[PDB]
Amino acid sequence: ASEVPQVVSLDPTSIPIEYNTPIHDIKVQVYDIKGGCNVEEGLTIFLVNNPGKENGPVKISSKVNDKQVSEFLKDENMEKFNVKLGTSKHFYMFNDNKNSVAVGYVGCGSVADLSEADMKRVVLSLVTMLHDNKLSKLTVVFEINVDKNLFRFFLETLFYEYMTDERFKSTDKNVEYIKHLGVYINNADTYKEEVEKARVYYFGTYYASQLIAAPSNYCNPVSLSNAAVELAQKLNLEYKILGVKELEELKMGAYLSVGKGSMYPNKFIHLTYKSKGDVKKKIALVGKGITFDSGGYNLKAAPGSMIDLMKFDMSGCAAVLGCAYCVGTLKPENVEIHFLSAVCENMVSKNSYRPGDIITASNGKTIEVGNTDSEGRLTLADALVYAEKLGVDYIVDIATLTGAMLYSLGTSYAGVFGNNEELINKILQSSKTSNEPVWWLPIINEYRATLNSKYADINQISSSVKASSIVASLFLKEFVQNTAWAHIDIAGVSWNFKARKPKGFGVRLLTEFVLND
Amino acid sequence: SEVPQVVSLDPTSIPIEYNTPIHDIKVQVYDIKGGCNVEEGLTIFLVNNPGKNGPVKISSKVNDKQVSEFLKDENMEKFNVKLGTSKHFYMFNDNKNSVAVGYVGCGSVADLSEADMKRVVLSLVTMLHDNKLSKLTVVFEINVDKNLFRFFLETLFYEYMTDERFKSTEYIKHLGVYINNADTYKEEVEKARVYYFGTYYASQLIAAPSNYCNPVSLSNAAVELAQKLNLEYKILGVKELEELKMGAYLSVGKGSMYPNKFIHLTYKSKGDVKKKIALVGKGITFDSGGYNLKAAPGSMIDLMKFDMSGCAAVLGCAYCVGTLKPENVEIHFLSAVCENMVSKNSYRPGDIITASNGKTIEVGNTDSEGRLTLADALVYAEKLGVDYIVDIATLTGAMLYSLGTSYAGVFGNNEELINKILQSSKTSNEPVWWLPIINEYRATLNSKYADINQISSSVKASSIVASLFLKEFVQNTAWAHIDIAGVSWNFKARKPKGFGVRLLTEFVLN
Amino acid sequence: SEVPQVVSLDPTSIPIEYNTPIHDIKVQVYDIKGGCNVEEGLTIFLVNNPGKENGPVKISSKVNDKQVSEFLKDENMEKFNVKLGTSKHFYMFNDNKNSVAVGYVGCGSVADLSEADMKRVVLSLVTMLHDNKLSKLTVVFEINVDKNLFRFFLETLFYEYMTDERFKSTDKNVNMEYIKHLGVYINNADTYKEEVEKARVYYFGTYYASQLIAAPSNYCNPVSLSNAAVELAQKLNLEYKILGVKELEELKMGAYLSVGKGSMYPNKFIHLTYKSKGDVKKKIALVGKGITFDSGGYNLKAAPGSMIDLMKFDMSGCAAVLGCAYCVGTLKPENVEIHFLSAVCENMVSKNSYRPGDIITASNGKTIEVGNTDSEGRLTLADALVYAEKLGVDYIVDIATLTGAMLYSLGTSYAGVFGNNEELINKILQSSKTSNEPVWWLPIINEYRATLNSKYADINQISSSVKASSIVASLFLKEFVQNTAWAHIDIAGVSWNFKARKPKGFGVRLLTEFVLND
Ligand SMILES: [Zn+2]
Ligand SMILES: [Zn+2]
Ligand SMILES: [Zn+2]
Ligand SMILES: [Zn+2]
Ligand SMILES: [Zn+2]
Ligand SMILES: [Zn+2]
């Protein structure tokens, strides 16, 4: 751990991380539907659909072990409510023991097979009923048909949206969290091995979200690397933080040039998880770690640049650290995973690197900088050369690289590039089981000639092709010569603009990829 | 039928070259095992070197001593095989006649990509534009399959041809080819000549400016082309697009001095019909952007004569299908042609219009007029009761930021049809990539007053949002959507590509 | 106290002219009923013609010279009208065979001259003073003005007459000579006499603030500006206190210190105090925005229209507060205690600068999510308002060149005032009337408050949903005044005289009249 430099004594010297969230205190109990439901204290919610009939009537098909509540939930009373996706209603009644209970439902539409987006819409309605109410238990009854991955996704998303980050509130606050969660589902014994898997995947996403949402005066190269050391110490992971003196010896000129104009020294994070049984799989995960992207002398001054959001330019690093928690907790075997990130800050200063400067990567390649705001591929280039030297089988990088993703895939799907069938297909398969959507995009070799520099070995940016995401992959491909490599561009999907919060995108996708090899 | 004019000097028809000098070239393919003979003309070797860029080495028992000593390995070490380099020299043969010999480097990747093979053709054509010879012979010292060989011939013919219809102030007559299994490539020769003109014909329509190529003159050429090919044809006028209530399509052309014209060509095969296909192309002869005028930097208003490339690709496909005459297929070539102008009669941003299927649309941007014309075209296409609907359009400039200028994007609601398009992209060597229709963005097309919004005001993924809009007008048929806004125009050479003609034709034939 | 330098040629102090040529002018006011003696220099008549749109000129004062009375006869003035701003020069010899200069300045046909009208009248008078080498100017008031307007005439005459040449070297005006005497003939002269030395005090307070604003940011920095304020307090004998970075750290002024993080000049907080002899019945804290240069930070002023070259004036509010400190310290009002406050710093681009998105903690514990580094004025004032409320005052008045949106609402003439208390606003408007510095009342719309709700911090610095930045900024400042009556004057549009290429010194007379009438 290094000392965080400060301009004034009021500058923060560490990122606040919440490890023991109220989600961790929720006792989760799952029961089988073929045994009846017991309407207890708190709120009991039914997940109901109606296949074929758009906005069809509500019909409860589960045995309720209460004569009074069964009379309330009869077909001749559900009738006036429909199953439109996202609709919710509250019921108040008295049970057989003359006790007042609260019951309700959330409509799951028709369609029968709900997408990840549709399930989020259902979960958001569920959270609205959990909000502004002081319940001690919530019970969810699954009268919709879901597989194991979608059931785990339901719990992960519910935990994540229910959780509220108040680390930076002072004068502001309000009300409490439920202490128990009940789940009724057919074949319940098969679904509940996913419960504690969902709790692990939740915190990894929330931990990544905590690091992303942390501003750049809190989350800087020094404090971000310190948090990775702190996380590795709790999970007993091997760790090494590379300082400038070691990065100078490794000749990481591309990575070092980006951080020249920062008051925080560059810090390269290298975490390692090793298995007990002999290792038959070696994987290196690389994340872009720019704690703040001012753009450099190519300053983000255009209206659409969204510079006030550029604290999220380390979303790739947070996704890898979130994976380090999930992998470090569940402990898969026969794998070595290397969690890497070249962390720095891209600022404007007398010491900053200039547009037009020619820099040398750690593999000997010289690069002519055409735009200082394209610093991601420069830091990733040195990180990929470092990653390949570790002798791994797969290299997967994740980065908020290009704003062009907002104009290609948008805010819902991330893009994956690569040089190999199966690493892309294994990543695409992991997107299916993790329910984090990713789309395969091409590396068009015709654009490679536009990176031909007149003086340096290669140009950092193209001079003609406006497809920045594809050109960046072509540039990064030049720094992986022999290893299977894939690249995930999450620049469009990392931040939830409507909810004004991070998504923690990549944690579950990367973890599922490690666990399925 | 009659093109309106403002002044008497305004043109009233698109000029088209039907008989190009390429059609006069007799092509002959021989097997390389018998050796090469350089009697007359210019002979060019296509050379590679797995392990380069290193020197070229000619492998041929060329039966002329003067050129054979010149082509010796000791004399070709001073030239390299870098992708694109070329050197050609002229000298005397055994009969004391002047001949020219040279090479084109093909790199070290053994299998040339579509872009790599193109670059080889450009180097070969460069020497052809500085040539006054009567015969050219090409020797393939590289490995090419049957589809890439045809692609080589098409690109050679198309890049060699020069469009001089609008200029006011030569070609070889024989083409020789030496390659293994000349019998297998022989059948590919005349397919390339047909694929060439369909591409060149579409380029002629695209390159034709908007004062020459307008809704009336473009539909007149489609009829004239249909008569020479003998396809069924009907052109729908305004007075009866109004009867079909094509309000989205008719609103776009309101501000134009040219009446809207709907092109409908039909091909029917001799064998039994096992596939009914409708090909729809965006046909905006000029896109001013409407009252959302293309005034921002990057709008490229001077190139907006190319906004009918999808229609031109559909018309070019009608040539290839009408000439090669495939069977067991019935194809409808459709395009709703109009002009998007600024006028007192133009439609306004915010106007609510009604498509031919009853859906009300709130116009959010008049430059997004392409999806409005395609909406009514898809309702018309689905009413035909066809099995596949494939539309191709220069829809959104965001494609320049997604796939760029090389790869086109395809969206659709049917996995099987998408695979046919991707498989046809492989054999046609016109690259296309599959992009998703993410239903998550559909909610942003919810209009406060109309049935559906024309554009999304929040999601900046215009290519995906526009595909979501078109999907709302296809109820039951397998449908795919090819966006060629990024690939249609070749900005470096300042000329069209004719992109999509061979892609659609290969899809029909396979 | 020591100004840091990059090179040895960087200035280490703001040059200030204390003894201006105006202070050497002997001013004497005479009664118009006794007649005017024209003798030497230039004699100017302020003439009107009610009802007649630019009607003929009529000199209506008894002149004690037969020759000059014959020249000023009605039959000789066919050709000059009273059009507002029109002026004419006359040459003649008086009864003593001495050459004299006489003229007039047209004051229109509206018996009551507005503040803008009187400024146009004074500007015409100064044009006759320039390019001429006179030793006395004499003004004859043939128009009706109250005691406030007569004083306003003198202040504007003094202010426009003076020429600031501190930064000329090879281009000083060689033909620049100031008059040494000023005679004024006015109806009921004894009632206006007391306004003369009040006008001279009001002149320098306005001119002192103009000197500080016109000084560029390489001369006027946080250190040299606070050093000048100390020098001013010592000349006036006021209590003074300059708070350094270490004291501001202990007061937890995180918003103020975050703005100046990227500067080579340390933050300097000005705290001057004037206390009364006798019992005090009003405690007032005057807060002025003191941004010596506003580059905008990482939200750099790069868009067209931002006028990054004029941002040396972003400390105009501080200058207006210090200019009032001179007026209060000189006229010495009592039954009042005044605090002159300013959180002075520089908003720069550096590796140490604060970033968009950073969350900072104010001195009252509230966390703020920064949305735009160019909105730094409201950040420094927030800590200054919390500091002011701890002083236990009755009124808190802040003055700041806060939002460029003021240009599109009120323009370049009227300043905008916001507040949480009605009587304070009414007192500000009353001071605006008597000081003749126009101010208009604008609302603090509480419906916009919801757009300042931050997802992580206690409050957002900016809205970025509501485009009414002048109102939104007042919502923000209101969050840091809990119980005291507070008003806020936005002078971003009125501080700089774009046409005249010089500051206005706006606020000095307005604040002093507010202090003098409570
Ligand atoms: Zn960047
Ligand atoms: Zn970046
Ligand atoms: Zn358009
Ligand atoms: Zn268009
Ligand atoms: Zn500012
Ligand atoms: Zn400012």
mmCIF file of C-alpha atoms and ligand atoms in Angstrom, chain C residues 289 291 294 314 374 376-377 401, ligand 6:
data_model
loop_
_atom_site.group_PDB
_atom_site.id
_atom_site.type_symbol
_atom_site.label_atom_id
_atom_site.label_comp_id
_atom_site.label_asym_id
_atom_site.label_seq_id
_atom_site.Cartn_x
_atom_site.Cartn_y
_atom_site.Cartn_z
ATOM 1 C CA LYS C 289 -17.033 36.437 -5.289
ATOM 2 C CA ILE C 291 -12.152 34.482 -8.643
ATOM 3 C CA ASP C 294 -11.757 31.749 -14.311
ATOM 4 C CA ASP C 314 -14.653 37.114 -12.124
ATOM 5 C CA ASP C 374 -16.835 26.458 -14.498
ATOM 6 C CA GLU C 376 -16.951 27.376 -9.251
ATOM 7 C CA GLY C 377 -18.367 30.660 -7.940
ATOM 8 C CA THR C 401 -20.518 37.478 -11.408
HETATM 9 ZN ZN ZN D 6 -16.722 32.227 -12.228
#
